[PDB]
Every structure is written in C-alpha cells, then in structure tokens.
Amino acid sequence: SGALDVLQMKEEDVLKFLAAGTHLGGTNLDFQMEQYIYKRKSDGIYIINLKRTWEKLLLAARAIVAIENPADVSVISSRNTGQRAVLKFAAATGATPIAGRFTPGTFTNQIQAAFREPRLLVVTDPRADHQPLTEASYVNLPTIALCNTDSPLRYVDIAIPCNNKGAHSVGLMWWMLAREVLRMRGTISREHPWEVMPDLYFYRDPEE
RNA sequence: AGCUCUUUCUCGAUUCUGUGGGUGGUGGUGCAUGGCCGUUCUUAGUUGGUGGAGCGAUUUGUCUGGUUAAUUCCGAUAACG
C-alpha cells in the first residue's frame, strides 16, 4: 500500500479472519491459484495467506468506489450462504442485489422486463454462478469474485481469496468489503470501530 | 303433327331469305378451377418474436423426473415472455 497504517493490516481483523476460518482453504490448487497459497499443512488443507488477502481486498474495493453513481454495481449469489450476506451489502452501499437463480439472458436481451445493465459485477464462487460470468463478456463488464483455492479463473479480472465453503467465512468477507468502501468514499472513516456487526451478514441457518 | 302432298282462303311487315354474330347443352375434362365434404387424426399436436448454440441445412424454447384423459400441471432449466 503506502499509507501509514490506515490502509494496512490492523491487529483486530486478524483475529476475526482466524475465528471465522477464512485462512483455511480447500484440498486442490490450480495453476493460477498458487500465488496466494503459501504452503500445505500436515493435513490436506492448503493455507491461504492473509497478507495476500489484505492487499487484494483493497484495490478490489477501490474499483467498486470509482463509479460515480453506485446503483449499478450488481451483486449476485445463488448459493444459500451468500444470500443473507449480499442483501445487507446492497442495503449498506448502493448496489442492486440478484439473489437466487439468475435467469439467464439478463443483460443479453433487449426485451425482458427484468433487463439490467450494470457496469461491474461482484460474484460469489465462480463455479456456482457460471451463467452471469459467461454473459459478462457479451456486454464488456469488469468482474470481481471470491475464489476458493481451486475455482476456475477465467473472466475474473481480480480475485479476493477466501475459504468460502460456507460457515462464517462467507458473511465475514462481504462485511469487510462493505467496511472498506465506506471508509474511502463516505465519511464513516474514523479508524475506530464500525458500529455494524459482522454477525448479521452471516447465513440465516435453520433456527431454534 | 297442315309433318308432307292434293285443294285455297286467312293473317299483314311482327316476319322471311343470305351472311356475319351468337345462344343453348345432365357434352368432355374433378389432372384447368371455386365452393363443399371425406380422410390422414380424434390421438395431442402446431408456430413466430427477442436472445443463445452452429460456416450452414437447423436447433434451443416445445424438458431428466413426478402427474394428468390431455404440449394437463408441478418442478427442473440458455432461455424469457
């Protein structure tokens, strides 16, 4: 980075990452996903580094800020875990959520009453939301997403590594993303702790 | 049957005679046609728009499954309406 400590790692957030198990990562690698891994464990787990997570969070977020009108940075997730997360995301920062089954042809059509035309996309898990990704390259959208350690990289301009096999790893990462964009664009910045909880960005989950 | 012939009046330009031109026909052609009907077919089938996939003829939509008497619905889903 280059800012003094106000765009660099904080002692607090390290604890939150490790409590939510984001550092742990799946038992497979790609030829593009080996530049964020450090090494393997005794176990089949492959340990994502959090330094490498932190830088990628920032320039990803700075691009989300750069649009003049935030009302067309369309977020998407279809897996259950990333549903509750995206809804709070797009409430907090001006965005348009697309929860559940995508319904393809959304941006390709001209005649469709659910037609959209955003600029950016922020997708959870490339290999569950493959339909909008393929469709991104017909309308010249930049793309950002959360990769595991083995998700295919293709139509992903920038990645933000994560564990993302569920748990608290999903909701935590979307919460952190929303923290950063408000520090930069808004006036929420104070470098002293944000009021909003990462708790209500987690999965609803079958209740008591 | 004044049809024809013998016999010899009546009607009065409507006709008659020649040519041209038509008119009529349960004549032919249903393989020149309209209309109507039968059958394929009484089963559940049929199509375009916009978008996607193919150099293209085309295809997807119009479906693995359950369900219904039924392309009848539920559901799933590069298709949507």
Side-chain angles (χ1 to χ4, degrees):
Chain A
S1 293
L4 301 311
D5 192 62
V6 296
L7 294 173
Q8 299 194 114
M9 197 175 278
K10 300 296 191 65
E11 181 70 283
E12 310 84 66
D13 292 68
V14 179
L15 312 175
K16 306 180 194 301
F17 284 134
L18 289 168
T22 58
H23 63 298
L24 307 175
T27 62
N28 288 298
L29 298 174
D30 302 311
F31 69 111
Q32 298 288 355
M33 286 301 289
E34 53 186 359
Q35 59 180 355
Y36 298 124
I37 300 298
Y38 264 41
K39 50 182 173 294
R40 198 178 188 183
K41 203 176 179 184
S42 301
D43 302 298
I45 306 175
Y46 284 81
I47 309 177
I48 317 179
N49 200 37
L50 295 174
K51 193 61 59 179
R52 297 284 181 155
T53 305
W54 187 277
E55 284 80 74
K56 297 299 299 183
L57 193 66
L58 292 168
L59 77 172
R62 301 205 307 170
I64 295 169
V65 168
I67 195 170
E68 294 182 51
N69 173 233
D72 62 300
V73 173
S74 290
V75 299
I76 310 181
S77 189
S78 55
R79 55 189 298 191
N80 302 102
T81 55
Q83 294 181 310
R84 206 288 181 90
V86 298
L87 253 291
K88 305 307 293 295
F89 188 80
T93 305
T96 301
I98 305 179
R101 185 175 179 266
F102 180 57
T103 305
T106 308
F107 316 139
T108 324
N109 283 301
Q110 296 170 56
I111 300 176
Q112 181 182 359
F115 179 77
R116 287 294 295 110
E117 186 173 359
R119 186 175 298 184
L120 287 89
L121 294 173
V122 189
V123 178
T124 309
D125 199 294
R127 206 199 302 123
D129 293 69
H130 55 88
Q131 294 297 114
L133 296 173
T134 51
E135 186 171 295
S137 58
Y138 297 138
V139 272
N140 305 63
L141 309 174
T143 306
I144 306 178
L146 285 66
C147 297
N148 187 358
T149 52
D150 58 291
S151 298
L153 274 60
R154 170 173 292 206
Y155 306 124
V156 178
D157 292 295
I158 173 166
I160 309 176
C162 185
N163 179 57
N164 72 110
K165 285 192 174 298
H168 303 287
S169 300
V170 181
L172 187 61
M173 190 60 64
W174 283 103
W175 177 75
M176 289 193 177
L177 187 58
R179 196 181 72 158
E180 292 301 299
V181 296
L182 294 173
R183 287 180 169 195
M184 295 167 184
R185 186 180 56 75
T187 186
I188 287 70
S189 52
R190 187 176 62 160
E191 308 297 289
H192 288 301
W194 196 32
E195 307 79 59
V196 184
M197 287 286 188
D199 197 68
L200 40 60
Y201 267 67
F202 300 141
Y203 179 40
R204 183 183 178 183
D205 195 73
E207 298 180 288
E208 47 176 349

